[PDB]
Amino acid sequence: FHKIRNEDLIFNESLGQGTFTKIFKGVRREVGDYGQLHETEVLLKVLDKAHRNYSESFFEAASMMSKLSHKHLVLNYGVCVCGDENILVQEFVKFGSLDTYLKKNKNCINILWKLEVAKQLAAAMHFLEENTLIHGNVCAKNILLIREEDRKTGNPPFIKLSDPGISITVLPKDILQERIPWVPPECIENPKNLNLATDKWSFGTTLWEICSGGDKPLSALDSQRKLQFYEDRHQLPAPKAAELANLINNCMDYEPDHRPSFRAIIRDLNSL
């Protein structure tokens, strides 16, 4: 990871939180190509100081993302570990994360938009699967909208997958249970069961989000009832716009070995 100096970073408005992190919009002063000086908008993810003991996992999450380069993976600029801070510096995306965008724009997102976005996420996950690299936290809140759809120029939306944050293999069990149904049943039973098949299940959950205008599946269920949802082997209800329901359910297969490859997922999406 490239080391960025505290002095070159300006923190601006808070944008929200992640697990044990706070997230800000910021500006990075830098020397760019040809020696030109730039003030670049950046996303600043700050590990809580009370949770400094997660620093290794916090950065490992991003470092994995930066081992491979791909048009659908978020760009990490570097880290700032000056002083007592643990800061991840990433590209800033004007349109924010997908979960918010779906909620705010649900009255003007149709099936073709959802299919295009599903296809791009499937392509990103296929890239990871071919590199045998586990993401571990696929969800709409970890997808960024680079570009809106522009029908007038035929331009589709364009998304990127961001890093998974601190791994489920080190998080407390109550947080894992609160993350049902993105966390797959086998990882609730044993978080060290994290595997490539994990991301197929979470991909299904994320498709359900995309088809549900940003609703959170099972949000009405407390942690105890989410656990019992897995014990009783329930599936999610079909979204009202049900075009992707069968794919969602096929990805959310309680048997990890039966979940379809991302190449088969892509072939399925292209059939619609």
Arch. (CATH architecture) of 1-92: 2-Layer Sandwich (3.30)
Token duo for residue 187: 């990882």
Domains of the chain by residue range: 1-92, 93-272
Token duo for residue 122: 């499937």
* CA dist., res. 17 & res. 175, Å (int): 14
Top-level class of domain 93-272: mainly alpha
Q: How far from chain centre, in Å, is Cα 30?
A: 28
Matching residue, tokens 């643990």: 86
Contacts of residue 1, Cβ cutoff 8 Å, sequence gap at least 6: 59, 62, 63, 66, 76, 78, 79
In order of 10, 78, 124, 200, 208, the CA distances from 265 in angstroms are 42, 33, 12, 9, 14
CA distance from start to end of the chain: 41
Residue type, 137: N
In order of 10, 60, 89, 106, 212, the CA distances from 57 in angstroms are 25, 5, 16, 35, 31
Elucidation technique: X-ray
10 Å Cβ neighbour count for 44? 25
- Can you give the resolution of this entry in Å? 2.0
* CA dist., res. 196 & res. 132, Å (int): 7
Contacts of residue 144, Cβ cutoff 8 Å, sequence gap at least 6: 74, 93, 95, 96, 97, 98, 159, 160, 161, 162
Contacts of residue 178, Cβ cutoff 8 Å, sequence gap at least 6: 223, 226
